[PDB]
Design an enzyme around this catalytic site. Sequence first.
Site, PDB file in Angstrom:
ATOM      1  CG  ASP A   1       4.589 -10.768  -1.988  1.00 12.19           C
ATOM      2  OD1 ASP A   1       4.878 -11.689  -2.702  1.00 12.19           O
ATOM      3  OD2 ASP A   1       3.568 -10.954  -1.314  1.00 12.19           O
TER       4      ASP A   1
ATOM      5  CD  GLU B   1       1.692  -7.729  -2.992  1.00  7.74           C
ATOM      6  OE1 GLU B   1       0.986  -8.415  -3.706  1.00  7.74           O
ATOM      7  OE2 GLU B   1       1.910  -8.123  -1.847  1.00  7.74           O
TER       8      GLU B   1
ATOM      9  CG  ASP C   1       3.503 -11.227   2.865  1.00  4.85           C
ATOM     10  OD1 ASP C   1       4.163 -10.334   3.415  1.00  4.85           O
ATOM     11  OD2 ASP C   1       2.773 -11.055   1.887  1.00  4.85           O
TER      12      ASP C   1
ATOM     13  CB  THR D   1       9.019 -13.005  -3.097  1.00  2.00           C
ATOM     14  OG1 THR D   1       7.678 -13.490  -3.344  1.00  2.00           O
ATOM     15  CG2 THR D   1       9.055 -12.116  -1.873  1.00  2.00           C
TER      16      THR D   1
ATOM     17  CE  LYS E   1       0.016 -11.807  -2.514  1.00  5.00           C
ATOM     18  NZ  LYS E   1      -0.393 -10.447  -2.933  1.00  5.00           N
TER      19      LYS E   1
ATOM     20  CD  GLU F   1       5.021  -7.599   1.745  1.00  8.39           C
ATOM     21  OE1 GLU F   1       5.106  -8.132   2.854  1.00  8.39           O
ATOM     22  OE2 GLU F   1       4.384  -8.054   0.820  1.00  8.39           O
TER      23      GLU F   1
ATOM     24  NE  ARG G   1      -2.036  -6.817  -6.162  1.00  4.76           N
ATOM     25  CZ  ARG G   1      -1.860  -6.880  -4.845  1.00  4.76           C
ATOM     26  NH1 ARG G   1      -2.331  -7.904  -4.144  1.00  4.76           N
ATOM     27  NH2 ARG G   1      -1.214  -5.917  -4.204  1.00  4.76           N
TER      28      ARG G   1
ATOM     29  CD  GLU H   1      -2.543  -0.385  -0.935  1.00  3.36           C
ATOM     30  OE1 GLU H   1      -2.746   0.262   0.114  1.00  3.36           O
ATOM     31  OE2 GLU H   1      -1.542  -1.147  -1.081  1.00  3.36           O
TER      32      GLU H   1
ATOM     33  CD  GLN I   1      -3.530 -11.623  -4.258  1.00  5.73           C
ATOM     34  OE1 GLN I   1      -2.590 -11.062  -4.831  1.00  5.73           O
ATOM     35  NE2 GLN I   1      -3.912 -11.232  -3.043  1.00  5.73           N
TER      36      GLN I   1
ATOM     37  CG  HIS J   1      -1.896  -3.150   2.242  1.00  6.53           C
ATOM     38  ND1 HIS J   1      -1.812  -2.962   0.888  1.00  6.53           N
ATOM     39  CD2 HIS J   1      -2.081  -4.483   2.447  1.00  6.53           C
ATOM     40  CE1 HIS J   1      -1.931  -4.136   0.273  1.00  6.53           C
ATOM     41  NE2 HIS J   1      -2.103  -5.079   1.205  1.00  6.53           N
TER      42      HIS J   1
HETATM   43  C1  LIG Z   1      -4.424  -8.867   0.127  1.00  2.00           C
HETATM   44  P1  LIG Z   1      -2.813  -8.864  -0.132  1.00  2.00           P
HETATM   45  O1  LIG Z   1      -2.454  -9.169  -1.538  1.00  2.00           O
HETATM   46  O2  LIG Z   1      -2.253  -7.596   0.357  1.00  2.00           O
HETATM   47  C2  LIG Z   1      -2.198 -10.242   0.948  1.00  2.00           C
HETATM   48  C3  LIG Z   1      -0.715  -9.984   1.218  1.00  2.00           C
HETATM   49  O3  LIG Z   1       0.038 -10.287   0.344  1.00  2.00           O
HETATM   50  C4  LIG Z   1      -0.353  -9.322   2.535  1.00  2.00           C
HETATM   51  C5  LIG Z   1       0.244  -7.938   2.382  1.00  2.00           C
HETATM   52  O4  LIG Z   1       1.112  -7.766   1.530  1.00  2.00           O
HETATM   53  O5  LIG Z   1      -0.096  -6.980   3.033  1.00  2.00           O
HETATM   54 CA   LIG Z   2       2.428  -9.353   0.138  1.00  2.16          CA
HETATM   55 MG   LIG Z   3       5.653 -12.508  -4.794  1.00  3.37          MG
END
Ligand SMILES: CP(=O)(O)CC(=O)CC(=O)O
Ligand SMILES: [Ca+2]
Ligand SMILES: [Mg+2]
Lengths: 419, 416
Positions: free
Chosen positions: B233, B199, B126, B257, B253, B201, B237, B364, B240, B133
């Site tokens: 993903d 997330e 990843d 996924t 993570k 992606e 948090r 975010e 993490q 971001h």
């Molecule tokens: C800091 P984060 O949780 O975004 C690390 C990642 O997982 C990378 C990403 O998704 O941008």
């Molecule tokens: Ca990610």
């Molecule tokens: Mg994941």
Amino acid sequence: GSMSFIPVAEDSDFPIQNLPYGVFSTQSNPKPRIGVAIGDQILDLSVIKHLFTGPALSKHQHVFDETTLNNFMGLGQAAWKEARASLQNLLSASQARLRDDKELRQRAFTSQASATMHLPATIGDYTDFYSSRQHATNVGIMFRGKENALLPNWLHLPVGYHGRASSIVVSGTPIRRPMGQMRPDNSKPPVYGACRLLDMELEMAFFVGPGNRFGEPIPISKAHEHIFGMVLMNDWSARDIQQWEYVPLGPFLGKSFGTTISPWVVPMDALMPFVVPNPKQDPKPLPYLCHSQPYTFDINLSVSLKGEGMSQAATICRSNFKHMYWTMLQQLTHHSVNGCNLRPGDLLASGTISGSDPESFGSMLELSWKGTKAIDVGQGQTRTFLLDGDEVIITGHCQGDGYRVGFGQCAGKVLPALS
Amino acid sequence: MSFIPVAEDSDFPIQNLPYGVFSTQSNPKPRIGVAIGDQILDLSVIKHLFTGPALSKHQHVFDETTLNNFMGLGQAAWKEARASLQNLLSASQARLRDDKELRQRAFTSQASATMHLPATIGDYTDFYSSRQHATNVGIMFRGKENALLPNWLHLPVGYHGRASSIVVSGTPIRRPMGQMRPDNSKPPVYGACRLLDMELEMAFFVGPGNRFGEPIPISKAHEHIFGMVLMNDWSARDIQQWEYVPLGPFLGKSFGTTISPWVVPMDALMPFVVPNPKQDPKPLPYLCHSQPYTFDINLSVSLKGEGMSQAATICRSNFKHMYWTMLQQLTHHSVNGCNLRPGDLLASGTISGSDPESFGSMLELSWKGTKAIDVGQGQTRTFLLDGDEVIITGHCQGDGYRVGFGQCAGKVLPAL
Ligand SMILES: CP(=O)(O)CC(=O)CC(=O)O
Ligand SMILES: [Ca+2]
Ligand SMILES: [Mg+2]
Ligand SMILES: CP(=O)(O)CC(=O)CC(=O)O
Ligand SMILES: [Ca+2]
Ligand SMILES: [Mg+2]
Ligand code: NI
């Protein structure tokens, strides 16, 4: 002691008390196939698979015909124990079945000297832990200073990271010095070029047996059911590449250019005679990580370095697996506590193994103390980090009375970068 | 167009033709198919219709249970397969249209098919390549002065992910248990995570490997990009945050996924290519490429809670909000001699544009749980609740057609 009809030297890595599993081929037969080491021989399990007549293996003899150990690893401990008991009987000096079958014995055995070893399993996922307290403390002192050595989480969970599975290679594979991006000068942009701080990392690793289902943790009381056996590992690293890349998402290209394992997987049952009580943890871990079962092992580890002009390899590290702060049970439990699904053939490595004595530090980063001290590698020769042409060999053994359980070699030689 | 009817708003016109692994009630063996209209064309059934030079001796790749070996054949084989498919589905080579017997065995409904992962993923990586971001995370974690770390504009930062827990769209995701440290003055605790996130992606599959020890030069990187999927993903948090210094995201993570099942080939996405974002500072020469390799792909994320009657769109974003290209990511991943293999999955990073409506995670969108997200019908979110369903979709908008990605969906189950 115990004896096989196969001659075994007293200091052989491979007495009847060991019986590790591996994948080999020969000049006569290129098909990778499963064997067990005994003395200086290999017993080919594909040839004798019809002799596993017990309840656990009678319907599953095809696992011994595969090109990898994954399916046998996935069968679980009743099958492992049955296979081991069957092999201890068949190899016994006093058992006639295989011993006196001249034609079967002829096609069942081959010399280790003739054999080419292969990776023992197809590794779906590789994880590297950080579980040696002196190692993590040393890194902290070097990077952060004496006061800020361990980070706040280290004594509370077995910190680890996902590694690169594809670049795990069998002992004897040459390792090319990697190119990449580094930042030697903090007042200038990063540069591209050959790594200047190439390192070895003394580790051990275990293979996972039966998996767990996606979403279902492995309770620590059951963790021992999922550990098949162990190998030696050298997590080669590029310290300058690592340092520039790793904040904030962790080691990446600094590790993934090559990681070597030894080929003979020593089953946990062979290592249980060398189990000792676990080190005391303080603070006490959360209940999900708390286990009374002894699962710390007295395994003597040694690392040699031989430069390209040397005739004698220098021993640069003598250490022991019993130092580790977090056990394999805790690592496996923690790895699955969130529901992550471990699978047969996954590889979970210990972390770099360092004891308190500087003679037992497990990396040249530590042995040279960040390049500030010379490592003595034999009459008028020194190192800080690895040179082109250097060969690093890791060995390990448990010492019993009149026998040892050894691991064979975890070797590699450094090739010059493509630059 | 095709002899197969394609609705105007279909994800799967003859301009798309993505590859997937499917099975049916009648035949439970996973096998390779191509989506067209609301049908699947079974490539195991029509494997003998690939008669060109690259594929005639390699038709067995279409009989496998995964796409790995077809991915591994490389770009001449991919281009020939696509041309063969386009000529069969337009009936310029009329074997498939007119051979009724074959045709009745070759096509099955998407509705009746079960999709599987498209490949056996040896390694998943990843990246972190969306500037807004990474900037947002930096602001939230470090403050605006130290938003980006010193390496970010110099290399495509990324980490090794967990391959085993990559699951196909539709798989339920259990809220994970683990360690958390909500109070820094006290020991960590064990329990259900409290900050469960999605997330947004995208990811690409690798084609032919490179050999161990042999980098892929950036000039050749485009030869190794097979095709793309959508990805969620999922992350915890609070798990993490406690675990990730200094060796990176791990159990935060690896509990799950999700990827979409239909792999859209890069040749399908080339009409939608746009100029690469200007990089300043300019990257080192090993990362430099002139070829456009940034793509205009409209992405959407919906959330639907228990009790809610309709899903709320919580994110609208675009894959053109990426600072590092897939060529740069692939090249950087192999610069040290790391051996990429067919079927490896390299994900973009969470995709966020500058508009707050385009931010690609609930970390975010809720700004670290300080702002409530409006999800309709009186209801709000910061992070995901048990029973919430997140669905990611994506499409390119052409003239008279769209190249769509299908769905990347999952519903949250309560912690065990
Ligand atoms: C800091 P984060 O949780 O975004 C690390 C990642 O997982 C990378 C990403 O998704 O941008
Ligand atoms: Ca990610
Ligand atoms: Mg994941
Ligand atoms: C800090 P580091 O390089 O030791 C990270 C690891 O790779 C873990 C370890 O070997 O102990
Ligand atoms: Ca390591
Ligand atoms: Mg390594
Ligand atoms: Ni005895």
